[PDB]
Design a protein around this ligand. Structure first.
Ligand SMILES: O=C(O)C1=C[C@@H](OP(=O)(O)O)[C@@H](O)[C@H](O)C1
Length: 450
């Protein structure tokens, strides 16, 4: 963790066009779906990260899916043959890419034998080898997979016997566990022998929006999942093969999009995200229309683009109540916008209890740091209540608590960098995804730093 001193947004540019990096969640799914699909797909706007880099090399190794890059590595070309994969004999090294290991574990259960090997080995580093993966291994074994823990019980490394495939039919999966286990099974379900009924048991899953994103992406690749008539969390997946589209563009990250949009809202300037609109797979795409618009912003949104122009500085309106369940990651951004919407009514955000168990307690972190700016705030039973003030923010002193703590949480720091820009003197962010945001502050918004 490092330090960054954000200078006031003294005279921002009038208009600004920002294309955020691609979504991580969408990037990771697209590579699995393309590897299993039939046809050659050019994947654009992929987010390069631990998952994708390890995923890319893992798919490269398996026989039956070919990976290459074009246009200076910005285009990933995947040619699938319809999911007829065979072992290379190479151990697939996944580092500590948690999502890749969950997705690839079920892919490996589909792989056929070769003369080099009768199995697929999935490995990773020491942190990988402490990650629990039991609930997924249990469900695949229950469906005919043969999986051996090669080191510690319940984690990678895994040896998955090839040539077995998945029986299909009913697969039961506990609902308390990561949605990434559900998603991992959904994407491989069409390749089971028998059509799959994926029934979550033991309660309601928490990250339902990410299950829905997997289903919608599956539909883009030619396979429509259907929900049960009597069970909200039972999914019926046809047997089939994905049809790879000629091109698939990874949506830019709509959560990251909220920070430049909030900048425009908060400075009385204009920001356009030219490739994120109302047809987005991501709930956070609704931030502009469901948060910034009621708060006094002039907002236009087409199916694929979003433009936000804030009201004059100091003129944001409090949003008396907003349910941010469809977009919980954007509540930190909503909170700093609300901090300068003078009331009147407070801004009350509910539906974000799940946001209390992330890197830090983000609700608690937001209340405590807001106090440092002179912004009253308090927790609600289901969220947060912000008592916005005039842009008479507390003037910042040097080397005497000018530090805003980010609690090692990426989003907390980016949110408070916006509020920092509205103060009368520079503000230092302490204990500081999207490294380019700090670059974009200086290159696009032309904000001085350090
Ligand atoms: O499938 C995905 O891409 C994601 C599902 C969620 O995981 P959990 O269901 O474990 O919360 C989310 O927290 C994570 O950031 C990404």
């Amino acid at each position: 963790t490092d330090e960054v001193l954000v200078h006031p947004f003294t005279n921002p540019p009038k208009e600004n066009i920002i294309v955020p990096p691609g979504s991580k969640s969408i990037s990771n799914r697209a590579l699995i779906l393309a590897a299993l699909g039939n046809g050659t797909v050019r994947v654009k706007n992929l987010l390069h990260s631990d998952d994708t880099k390890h995923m890319l090399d893992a798919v490269a190794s398996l026989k039956g899916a070919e990976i290459s890059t074009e246009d200076n590595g910005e285009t990933i070309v995947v040619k699938g043959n319809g999911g007829n994969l065979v072992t290379s004999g190479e151990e697939l090294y996944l580092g500590n890419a948690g999502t890749a290991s969950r997705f690839l574990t079920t892919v490996a259960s589909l792989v056929g034998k070769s003369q080099a090997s009768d199995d697929v080995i999935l490995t990773g580093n020491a942190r990988m080898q402490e990650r629990p993966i039991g609930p997924l291994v249990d469900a695949l074994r229950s469906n005919g997979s043969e999986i051996e823990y090669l080191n510690k019980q319940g984690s990678l490394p895994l040896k998955i016997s090839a040539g077995n495939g998945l029986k299909g039919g009913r697969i039961e999966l506990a609902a308390t566990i990561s949605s990434q286990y559900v998603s991992s099974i959904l994407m491989c379900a069409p390749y089971a022998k028998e059509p799959v009924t994926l029934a979550l048991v033991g309660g309601k899953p928490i990250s339902q929006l990410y299950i829905d994103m997997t289903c919608a992406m599956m539909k883009s690749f030619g396979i429509e999942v259907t929900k049960s008539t009597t069970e909200e969390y039972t999914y019926h997946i046809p047997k089939g093969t994905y049809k790879n589209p000629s091109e698939y563009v990874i949506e830019s990250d709509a959560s990251s999009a909220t920070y430049p949009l909030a900048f425009a809202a908060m400075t009385g300037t204009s920001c356009t995200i030219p490739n994120i609109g109302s047809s987005s797979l991501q709930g956070d795409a609704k931030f502009a229309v469901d948060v910034l618009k009621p708060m006094g912003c002039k907002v236009e949104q087409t199916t694929t683009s979003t433009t936000v122009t804030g009201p004059p500085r100091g003129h944001l309106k409090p949003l008396p109540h907003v349910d941010m369940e469809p977009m919980t990651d954007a509540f930190l951004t909503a909170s700093v916008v609300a901090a300068v919407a003078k009331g009147g009514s407070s801004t009350s955000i509910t539906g974000i209890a799940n946001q209390r168990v992330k890197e830090c307690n983000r609700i608690e972190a937001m209340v405590t740091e807001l106090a440092k700016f002179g912004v009253p705030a308090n927790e609600l039973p289901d969220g947060i209540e912000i008592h916005g003030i005039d842009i008479e923010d507390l003037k910042t002193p040097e080397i005497s608590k000018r530090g805003v703590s980010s609690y090692d949480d990426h989003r907390v720091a980016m949110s408070f960098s916006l509020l920092a820009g509205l103060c009368k003197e520079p503000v230092l962010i302490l204990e500081r995804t999207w490294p380019g945001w700090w670059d974009i502050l200086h290159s696009k918004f032309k904000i001085e730093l350090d």
